[PDB]
Amino acid sequence: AYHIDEEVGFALPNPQENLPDFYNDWMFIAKHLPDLIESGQLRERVEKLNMLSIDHLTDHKSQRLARLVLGCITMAYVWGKGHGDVRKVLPRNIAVPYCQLSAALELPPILVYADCVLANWKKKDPNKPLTYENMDVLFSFRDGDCSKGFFLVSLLVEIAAASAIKVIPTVFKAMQMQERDTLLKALLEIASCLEKALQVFHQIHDHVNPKAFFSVLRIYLSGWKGNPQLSDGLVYEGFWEDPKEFAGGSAGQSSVFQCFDVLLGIQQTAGGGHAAQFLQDMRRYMPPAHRNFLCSLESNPSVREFVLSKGDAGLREAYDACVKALVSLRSYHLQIVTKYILIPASQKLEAKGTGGTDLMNFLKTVRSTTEKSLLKE
Numbered sequence: 001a002y003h004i005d006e007e008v009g010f011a012l013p014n015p016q017e018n019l020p021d022f023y024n025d026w027m028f029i030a031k032h033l034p035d036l037i038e039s040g041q042l043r044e045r046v047e048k049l050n051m052l053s054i055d056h057l058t059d060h061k062s063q064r065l066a067r068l069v070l071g072c073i074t075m076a077y078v079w080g081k082g083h084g085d086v087r088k089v090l091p092r093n094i095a096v097p098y099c100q101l102s103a104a105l106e107l108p109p110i111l112v113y114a115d116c117v118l119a120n121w122k123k124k125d126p127n128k129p130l131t132y133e134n135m136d137v138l139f140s141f142r143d144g145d146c147s148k149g150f151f152l153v154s155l156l157v158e159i160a161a162a163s164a165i166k167v168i169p170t171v172f173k174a175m176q177m178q179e180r181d182t183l184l185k186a187l188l189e190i191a192s193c194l195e196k197a198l199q200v201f202h203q204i205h206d207h208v209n210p211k212a213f214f215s216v217l218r219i220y221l222s223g224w225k226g227n228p229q230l231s232d233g234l235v236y237e238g239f240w241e242d243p244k245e246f247a248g249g250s251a252g253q254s255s256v257f258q259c260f261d262v263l264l265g266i267q268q269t270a271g272g273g274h275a276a277q278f279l280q281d282m283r284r285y286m287p288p289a290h291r292n293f294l295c296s297l298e299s300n301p302s303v304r305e306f307v308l309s310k311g312d313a314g315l316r317e318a319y320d321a322c323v324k325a326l327v328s329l330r331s332y333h334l335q336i337v338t339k340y341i342l343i344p345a346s347q348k349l350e351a352k353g354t355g356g357t358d359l360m361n362f363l364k365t366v367r368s369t370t371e372k373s374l375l376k377e
């Protein structure tokens, strides 16, 4: 369909954990990144790899795992230990398979949200539910980086959003079959589920330490677009001649928030402002099927103009309960950014620095664009 699952939403259902034996030399390096980065053998280990053909990867789930393996290796190679000794050329034995596979999955050749959260997980017990206690990630960068907590919590917020995503068919059908009562029950279920996704978001404090995120994990998630340590981008040796720039990972790459924006007719990606340009660009980092779902929603008739035209106050209050749950999420998110970036940065990403300023201004603009779509203030 649009690769949307009814249980896990945009998450890859039950990711694959093992690659064919043909790829053992890839898998060994990814499984041992904390150790290999710590000693400083990681970059040697990459430079001595053979060139493995991607032809022995024979389905989507196996391609997704291979992207996740190669994306983590690539971040470990470029940033190394995390202190400024960078590499600007990615050796051909990684770059050629990584670029070929990325072109086939229609994704930029850099680690994205959909690799390290949406496919980087397993159930411990396949019988018991999708809870933190029954889950684990497949790969980590450094001992102590809190990557399990950070990836698993993001995932659980995605799985929470799933119960709301499966109501979107009901909304477009109720509109055209002119079914007022079922449209209203649907809009309230969406809002109920966005409110539950916010409470799951609170669990990030239970599992992620600000100091570990800011001084360790954040560095391996960063990219090479507008990054002065790699001001021209990365050379993907043997595939493109010139360096190329790609952005680092963020849940701006999550289809979740963008999809309820389109649904509720809130015009973020609309305009030429720098906030609209960012959010549109982050769509190039989403899997193609999810990109297409988003664009499909953009073309269907407007839920906002429907509600606005029917003089029906219960409909307007149900629409508003959806707009409100997005403002809440985005406001809790500002708090999150303050606690995990602005405050640790003060111990150039500080609140009044050049980075911490443009990012808070972007986030506050998106939240305030959302808040304006309220029908009742």
Ligand code: HEM
Binding pocket: 153, 154, 157, 158, 208, 213, 249, 250, 251, 252, 253, 254, 257, 258, 330, 333, 336, 337, 340, 341, 359, 362, 363, 366, 367
């Ligand atoms: C330690 C935790 C987190 C931090 C520091 C953080 C930080 C940021 C920052 C700085 C941005 C600005 C855009 C960019 O530079 O890419 C951003 C964007 C965004 N983040 Fe986060 N984030 C965290 C976790 C999450 C989680 C768990 C979610 C949702 C599950 C999320 C959802 C979003 C969304 C949707 C955007 C795009 C802006 C918007 O649509 O309102 N973030 N995040």
Ligand SMILES: NS(=O)(=O)NCCSc1nonc1/C(=N/O)Nc1ccc(F)c(Br)c1
Binding pocket: 204, 205, 206, 207, 208, 209, 210, 211, 339, 344
């Ligand atoms: N680390 S700090 O910058 O110095 N703290 C400044 C205030 S935040 C804070 N204080 O206690 N817990 C905090 C927290 N908030 O989300 N998460 C957390 C912290 C430590 C851990 F080992 C784990 Br697991 C999770």
Ligand SMILES: NS(=O)(=O)NCCSc1nonc1/C(=N/O)Nc1ccc(F)c(Br)c1
Binding pocket: 112, 113, 116, 117, 150, 151, 154, 218, 221, 222, 248, 249, 250, 251, 252, 341, 349, 355
């Ligand atoms: N260089 S920077 O100033 O710190 N800007 C960094 C841009 S935001 C950021 N950084 O890490 N995570 C970020 C994020 N933001 O929503 N969500 C997130 C959550 C789970 C993931 F698997 C990934 Br991938 C991303």
